[PDB]
Amino acid sequence: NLYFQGAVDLDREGRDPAYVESIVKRSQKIVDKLELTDTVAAREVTTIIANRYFKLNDIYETRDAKVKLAKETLTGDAKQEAVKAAEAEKDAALYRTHFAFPADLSLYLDAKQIDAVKDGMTYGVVMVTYKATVDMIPTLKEEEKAQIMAWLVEAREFAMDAENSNKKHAAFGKYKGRINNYLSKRGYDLVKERKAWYERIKARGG
Amino acid sequence: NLYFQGAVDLDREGRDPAYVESIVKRSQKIVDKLELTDTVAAREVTTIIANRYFKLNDIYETRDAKVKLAKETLTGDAKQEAVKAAEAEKDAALYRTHFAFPADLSLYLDAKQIDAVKDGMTYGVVMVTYKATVDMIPTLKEEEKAQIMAWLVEAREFAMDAENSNKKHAAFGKYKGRINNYLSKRGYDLVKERKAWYERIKARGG
Numbered sequence: 001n002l003y004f005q006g007a008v009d010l011d012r013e014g015r016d017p018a019y020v021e022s023i024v025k026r027s028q029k030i031v032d033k034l035e036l037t038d039t040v041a042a043r044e045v046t047t048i049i050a051n052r053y054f055k056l057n058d059i060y061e062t063r064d065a066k067v068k069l070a071k072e073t074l075t076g077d078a079k080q081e082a083v084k085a086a087e088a089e090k091d092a093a094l095y096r097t098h099f100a101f102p103a104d105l106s107l108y109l110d111a112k113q114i115d116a117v118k119d120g121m122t123y124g125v126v127m128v129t130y131k132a133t134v135d136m137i138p139t140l141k142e143e144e145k146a147q148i149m150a151w152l153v154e155a156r157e158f159a160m161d162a163e164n165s166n167k168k169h170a171a172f173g174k175y176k177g178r179i180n181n182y183l184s185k186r187g188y189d190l191v192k193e194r195k196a197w198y199e200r201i202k203a204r205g206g
Numbered sequence: 207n208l209y210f211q212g213a214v215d216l217d218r219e220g221r222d223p224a225y226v227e228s229i230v231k232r233s234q235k236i237v238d239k240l241e242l243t244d245t246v247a248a249r250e251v252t253t254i255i256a257n258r259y260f261k262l263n264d265i266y267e268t269r270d271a272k273v274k275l276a277k278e279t280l281t282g283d284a285k286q287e288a289v290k291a292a293e294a295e296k297d298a299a300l301y302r303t304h305f306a307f308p309a310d311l312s313l314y315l316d317a318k319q320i321d322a323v324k325d326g327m328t329y330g331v332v333m334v335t336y337k338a339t340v341d342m343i344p345t346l347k348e349e350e351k352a353q354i355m356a357w358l359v360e361a362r363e364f365a366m367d368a369e370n371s372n373k374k375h376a377a378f379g380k381y382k383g384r385i386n387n388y389l390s391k392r393g394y395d396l397v398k399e400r401k402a403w404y405e406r407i408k409a410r411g412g
């Protein structure tokens with residue numbers, strides 16, 4: 001499956017060609033899982049995803065340059081304030097660019113397909129985590145399931161903008177922590193549920 | 207239709223009661239247009255919307271205090287840099303809180319209803335603008351319509367977070383400018399289309 005640009009320009013200029021190729025291949029792999037039937041649309045979506053990876057890269061490079069300058073020049077509270085300001089500026093750049101991404105995708109993809117792109121950019125952690133949680137506690141109430149999914153989908157919106165795998169898993173981890181705490185406050189004995197789950201996994205040949 | 211809090215706490219503490227009442231009434235009016243059939247869900251959604259108005263208010267109050275301090279203490283480039291930093295910090299606060307809002311709404315509302323809330327918070331400018339544009343140029347291509355709608359929906363995502371009516375209309379205005387420029391670059395004679403549209407409006411008794 002050889003990628004070629006379509007109408008959407010690939011933001012390749014001035015970038016290391018091996019990096020560009022790695023991002024395009026990553027992006028192609030996400031698009032493959034959509035099983036699109038319009039080969040031109042598939043190229044366009046590939047480019048849109050790649051360009052978003054590249055722009056995120058640039059945002060984080062900017063942030064890192066500011067933090068490097070702070071490490072070299074500042075200490076104590078002044079240093080922490082400069083790091084805080086760089087992080088706010090990073091989150092601002094994410095805000096300013098976040099909505100254009102599904103806007104652009106929507107020219108080619110429906111809502112379900114756009115969600116599948118989000119999942120592709122975030123290792124499908126939403127459904128892995130949701131399925132595991134309901135496997136662990138099969139009598140969760142519908143409202144508990146709904147809240148758990150809502151938090152995972154929120155986590156995904158942040159994770160898709162994160163810098164790398166480590167930071168993506170940290171974003172999910174925050175909301176997994178929230179889920180854990182939520183269930184314990186709602187009266188579930190998580191030690192007991194988890195122990196019984198492991199027994200069920202063994203009993204079914206997992 | 208008297209509002210009463212449900213399970214979601216209204217973020218009322220320390221706020222002027224007339225302001226609280228005004229925001230609750232605004233929020234109730236948005237929810238009324240959803241025509242929900244679960245009266246408890248309607249109260250919860252009312253509270254969620256009101257609480258988002260209140261949090262946006264607080265974000266803008268923070269931003270304004272920083273800009274006031276800059277006006278009182280700084281001039282020239284230093285002043286512009288402090289204003290820039292306050293705006294980045296504001297956009298950061300918007301980013302950090304934006305995704306929780308539809309997450310919370312999703313416990314009560316489907317995707318279509320959530321969009322109707324977004325429209326309610328933004329004076330329905332998306333559909334007014336879209337309908338007017340297709341009325342003005344009825345032979346737009348499907349891809350042009352799609353791009354126009356995508357830009358209006360993007361505009362809405364920013365507008366729903368804006369401070370007031372003036373700033374909401376400015377957010378839409380940016381993307382209306384983009385639409386105007388887009389159509390002229392795609393070969394439409396906007397002077398001619400607009401003139402012929404006005405004739406059609408007159409001919410139909412508008």
Ligand SMILES: [Cl-]
Pocket residue numbers: 003004005010
């Ligand atoms: Cl190419």
Ligand SMILES: [Cl-]
Pocket residue numbers: 209210211216
């Ligand atoms: Cl109340």
